[PDB]
Each structure stands twice: as C-alpha cells, then as structure tokens.
Amino acid sequence: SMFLPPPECPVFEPSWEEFADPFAFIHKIRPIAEQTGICKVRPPPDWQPPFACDVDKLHFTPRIQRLNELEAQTRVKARDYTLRTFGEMADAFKSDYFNMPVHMVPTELVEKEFWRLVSTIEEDVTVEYGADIASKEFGSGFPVRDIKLSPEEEEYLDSGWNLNNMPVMEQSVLAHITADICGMKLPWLYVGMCFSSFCWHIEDHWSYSINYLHWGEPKTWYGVPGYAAEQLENVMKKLAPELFVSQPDLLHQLVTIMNPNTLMTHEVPVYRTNQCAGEFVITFPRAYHSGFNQGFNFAEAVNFCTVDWLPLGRQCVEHYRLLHRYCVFSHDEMICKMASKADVLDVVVASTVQKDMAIMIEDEKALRETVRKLGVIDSERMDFELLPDDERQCVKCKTTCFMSAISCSCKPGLLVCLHHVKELCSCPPYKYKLRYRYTLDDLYPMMNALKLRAE
Numbered sequence: 001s002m003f004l005p006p007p008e009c010p011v012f013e014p015s016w017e018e019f020a021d022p023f024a025f026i027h028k029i030r031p032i033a034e035q036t037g038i039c040k041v042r043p044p045p046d047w048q049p050p051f052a053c054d055v056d057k058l059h060f061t062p063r064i065q066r067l068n069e070l071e072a073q074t075r076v077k078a079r080d081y082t083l084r085t086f087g088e089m090a091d092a093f094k095s096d097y098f099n100m101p102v103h104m105v106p107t108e109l110v111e112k113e114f115w116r117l118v119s120t121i122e123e124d125v126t127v128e129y130g131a132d133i134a135s136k137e138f139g140s141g142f143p144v145r146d147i148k149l150s151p152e153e154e155e156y157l158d159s160g161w162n163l164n165n166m167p168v169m170e171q172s173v174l175a176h177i178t179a180d181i182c183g184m185k186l187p188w189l190y191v192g193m194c195f196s197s198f199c200w201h202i203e204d205h206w207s208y209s210i211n212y213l214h215w216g217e218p219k220t221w222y223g224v225p226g227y228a229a230e231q232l233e234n235v236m237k238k239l240a241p242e243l244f245v246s247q248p249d250l251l252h253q254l255v256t257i258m259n260p261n262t263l264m265t266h267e268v269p270v271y272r273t274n275q276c277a278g279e280f281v282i283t284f285p286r287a288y289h290s291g292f293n294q295g296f297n298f299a300e301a302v303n304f305c306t307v308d309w310l311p312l313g314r315q316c317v318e319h320y321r322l323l324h325r326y327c328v329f330s331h332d333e334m335i336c337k338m339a340s341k342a343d344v345l346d347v348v349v350a351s352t353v354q355k356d357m358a359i360m361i362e363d364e365k366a367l368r369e370t371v372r373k374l375g376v377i378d379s380e381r382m383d384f385e386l387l388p389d390d391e392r393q394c395v396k397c398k399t400t401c402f403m404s405a406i407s408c409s410c411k412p413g414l415l416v417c418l419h420h421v422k423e424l425c426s427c428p429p430y431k432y433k434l435r436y437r438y439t440l441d442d443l444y445p446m447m448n449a450l451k452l453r454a455e
C-alpha cells in the first residue's frame, strides 16, 4: 500500500447558538482542535450565504505549478483566464487525466494519485491556479458593502463568519490596528483545479487562519498540531536542507510538498480532512498544514488573532529574530496602539493586552540597562511607526524595530535592535544613540489604562 491516509481531524457541527459568535466557539473547541492543528466546522443548515458571480467578467492572472515532492516553491509570485475559461480548462484536465466524468472520480483515488504523481519525477504534471486578495477585477465571495444588495446579501454583511468582518470584530486583537497590512487583515481568494496544491507552511506571526470553501469540488487538507512544529521542521531539514538556506526577504520563503506518511514515519502526528463546499477549516497557531484541490473550486481565507494568540505572537517574533527572518508587522507596535486605545477596547482584550505589555516593559527595561552598560549614553525619542517597514529592520536579525533601536551617525539610516548593539559599526559605543519610542515613564501609565479598562 503506497499511501495510508492520516486519521480524520475533528469535525464540529455547532448549533445556531454556539455558531453565532465565532470567537466564543473557537475558544470552546480549542482544547480539542489545538491537539490536531486543524479542524473542520459545518455551519448550521440554514446559514447559507448567497454566492453570485458572472463567470465571464471575473478574470485573474494564473500561477503555474510543478508537482514534485521536496522541490522548492515560494508562496508569493501569462494571459488572464476568466473564471469560465479557467473552469473549462480545469474540468477538461481532470476529465482527460482520469478518462472519467469529474464527479465520478472518488476523492480517495485523487488523493492516492496525487501522492503517486508528486513522488515520480518521471511524471511532469503542471497545473494552474489563482491566488490573490480581493480586487475590482475579482472580488470577495462574501457580500461586501458598496450596487444595490438583495435582502439575502444584506443578512450576511454583518456575519461574524463573513471573512471580511472577522479581523475587525471586537474580540479580534487586530481590530484597532492602524498599520496597513494587506496580508493579515484582508482575505485571500484561491481558485483551484485538480491537484493544484498548497505546500507545507504555518501562518505569518503564527496566527490562526479560517478558510471557507464557497463552491466546487473539495479541498483536501493535512494538518499538524502546534506542539509538533519543530519536529516537522527537523524532518524537513534532514530531507530537504535547501529550503532552509537564508533568503533575502519575506517574498522569498521556500516551501515544499511532502507526503504526510513520511512525517508520520518520523513520529509527527498528522490529521486529514476533505473540506466540501459550505464548510470551514480552522488552523491553529503554529499548526503546519498543506493540501491540494480535488477539482475546480473557489475558496476564501483570512488570518486572525485572538487573545489566546497574543503570547504566541510574542514568542513568534523572538523565534523570527533567532532565525533572522523578516516580520510582517511589529508586535510591540500593535500592543502600544491597543494600549493607546484602552478606553474603547473589549475588556477581555484589555486584560490580555495588559499582561503582554507587562512582559514587554520588563524585557525592554532589562535591554536598555544592558545597552547603557555597553556605553551607549546619548538618546532621543524616535517615532518608528513613521518609517517605511524596510527602513527600520535590525541590520543583523531583520526584526522590525519599534520600542527602541541603536543608530550611529557613521551609518546614516541603519539600525540595530538592542540585542545586536555590537553589530552596527566599528565606532565606539559613546558615538551611538539609543532611539526610543517611549520612556519607561510613558509606558507604565499606558499599561495602567489597560488595567483600569479590564477593571
């Protein structure tokens, strides 16, 4: 037997009452789902968002994909397809590949065959797909405000499970952040075809993700719990070390296709599911996942960050620093933005932010004491949030600075974070300046505002 399917991941069928609040529901299932990394959610029977589109007016630029196990690919990027011409190409591909009608090809068989073809470099199957944020050429699958909407479209505008709303809801910790992240708060649209595949990965900053399949043939998933992320990476490192070489930026991270049986052989727990149209898949923090499409389909996905995630978010940026990997945003900047809005925060959010802020302040206090002992004496307040992100990365570890950094007039524009004072230039430390966003005396009242809000 060449492929043994992993065990099924948890499937939840919440009542209307349980379903109404996505954040409460996710918190409820967390003790179960965090052990499997992914889970599937079937909405109540009458939660049925309307899907309507003109398949001739939606168009997109396709990406192309070779399907070889262990071969390097990248997450970020030909004549356009319309949704109709992509669909015709996709249906004909599958139909011809199997010499069968597409909805007569068993899901078990497509899966078995996927793992055969990626392992056999004699086969050079290539497929195409779409992947992008919503645009005027190809918009969200959920209702958004703008056009006169139907009554049914209007009902789902404000849904918690409308993925456009998820990040700006009250229990989301990104609800009041000002920085423009196209990646972390905007949904991505994915147009799939048979065998088009997403390589093993975790989300930026170890966030959650929620993924909805609007219509079409199923999407097959493999997931690994967060506690096993480093085991998985060690397996990857032994079998494909090329994927771990340092890359110039975040538009360059390498990822790959790998058979889940190979992971399971090395004691990594893996779970599977077939996500059908109308179902959600949720991925938990640091939970590795991968998969492929059974045929022509359309999915929508978004990152999100709950209060549960906050401490993991801090750990992630620490992990990025040790690896010299670029950040998408400054975690500390997000924390201080929320503290500056303490009076309008949800009170549980306020309570959790306060705890992370206390850790941030004590770490910052110790770091500033250490660089003072290195002989850095001069200092000046600096509004880091005003710099383009690529103008405030630590020269050494690439972390996005916000709380503080060291500069030297010798190297105009260059910064190091306070872990890397010795990595900036050859000048003696008294030539350096500590650039800081806030004094410790600024920070304690900000934290107290959170405590008062949390009561």
Ligand SMILES: O=C(O)CSc1nc(-c2ccccc2)cc(=O)[nH]1
Residues within 6 Å of the ligand: 007, 008, 009, 010, 011, 012, 032, 036, 271
């Ligand atoms: O049965 C379901 O799919 C959801 S409820 C539930 N699932 C699980 C579970 C399901 C699949 C894989 C691992 C655990 C454990 C548990 O205690 N409860």
Ligand SMILES: O=C(O)CSc1nc(-c2ccccc2)cc(=O)[nH]1
Residues within 6 Å of the ligand: 075, 076, 129, 131, 190, 191, 192, 196, 197, 198, 211, 289, 293, 299, 301
């Ligand atoms: O990437 C996830 O976890 C969302 S599921 C999904 N992703 C992709 C994808 C993701 C990133 C870059 C390219 C494709 C394609 C697809 O058909 N599905």
Ligand SMILES: [Cl-]
Residues within 6 Å of the ligand: 067, 068, 069, 117, 118, 119, 120, 121, 122, 123, 124, 125
């Ligand atoms: Cl192949």
Ligand SMILES: [Mn+2]
Residues within 6 Å of the ligand: 201, 202, 203, 209, 283, 289
């Ligand atoms: Mn993902």
Ligand SMILES: [Zn+2]
Residues within 6 Å of the ligand: 394, 395, 396, 397, 398, 399, 416, 417, 418, 419, 420
């Ligand atoms: Zn650094």
Ligand SMILES: [Zn+2]
Residues within 6 Å of the ligand: 408, 409, 410, 411, 425, 426, 427, 431
């Ligand atoms: Zn210098």
